[PDB]
Amino acid sequence: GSMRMILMFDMPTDTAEERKAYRKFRKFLLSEGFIMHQFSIYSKLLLNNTANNAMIGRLREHNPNKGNITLLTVTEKQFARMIYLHGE
Amino acid sequence: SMRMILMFDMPTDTAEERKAYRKFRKFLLSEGFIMHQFSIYSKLLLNNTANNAMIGRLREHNPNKGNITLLTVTEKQFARMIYLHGE
Questions:
Q1: What's the first-to-final CA gap in chain A, in angstroms?
Q2: Is B13 annotated as a binding residue?
Q3: Nearest-CB residue to B77 (from A40, A69, A73)
Q4: What is the rounded distance in angstroms from the CA atom of residue B4 to the CA atom of residue B43?
Q5: Is the dihedral of CA B80, A19, A85, B63 positive or negative?
Q6: Which of A9, A36, A85 to mutate to test the interface with B (most CBs of B within 10 A)?
Q7: Rounded to whole angstroms, how far apart are CA atoms A34 and A44?
Q8: To probe the interface with B, which of A72, A74, A82 has the most B CB atoms within 10 Å?
Q9: Which conformational region is residue B25 in: left (phi greater than 0), alpha (psi within -120 to 50 degrees), or beta?
């Protein structure tokens, strides 16, 4: 069955090189069909476990220098109940 | 036996930002969250009333530019979590 992947992304961005890498990875995520819900928070519906495994490999391959990717599969009910808080 | 997972992100390029991050981390530990990574914390899911109060406290202490995501999953689902760090 389908697998909703939550993806969090964070990396240092004090250098120009880093910010370019950040923009590159974000553009990659979008081209792969992730949607950005808020800064650092993305998700994609993967069709099945095979697709999910291929995606994890792709993500590792495309992760920038110093990039940190958190991946968690959630059920649709868990996804609907997600809570987000923004600081100011 | 559900686990509440808290994921926290904020820019920490400046020393001031990293300081604010550490202050929030200290607060999370004081709220009974357990640390699993710089950005990843968990605790056993509270009853609804207590859970609402805690969410209010999290909202209040969230730094400027802070992003808090709460998800509730089973232990087995939480164990499947992946963290990828680029060399």
A1: 39
A2: no
A3: A73
A4: 5
A5: positive
A6: A85
A7: 5
A8: A72
A9: alpha
Do A18 and A64 form a contact (C-beta atoms < 8 A)? Answer: yes
Say how far apart CA A10 and CA B9 lie, in whole Å. 7
Contacts of B66 in chain A (CB under 8 A): 85-88
Q: How far is CA B13 from CA A10, A15, B70, in A?
A: 11, 9, 24
Nearest Cα neighbor of A50 from A58, A38, A42, A61 is: A58
Kindly compute the dihedral angle of the four CA atoms of residues B39, A82, B63, B19, in this order, to the nearest 10 degrees.
0
Please choose, from the candidates A48, A47, A36, the residue with its C-alpha nearest in 3D space to the C-alpha of residue A9: A36
Q: How far apart are CA B27 and CA A7, in angstroms?
A: 24
- Tokens describing residue B38: 């710089």
Q: In this complex, which of B67, B80, B84 lies closest to A40 when CB atoms are compared?
A: B67
Residue A28 — φ and ψ, nearest 5°? -65, -50
The ranges assigned to domains in chain B are: 1-87
CA–CA distance, B24 with B18 (Å, rounded to integer): 10
Q: Are A61 and A12 in contact (CB under 8 A)?
A: no
What is the separation of C-alpha B7 from the centre of its chain, rounded to a whole number of angstroms? 4
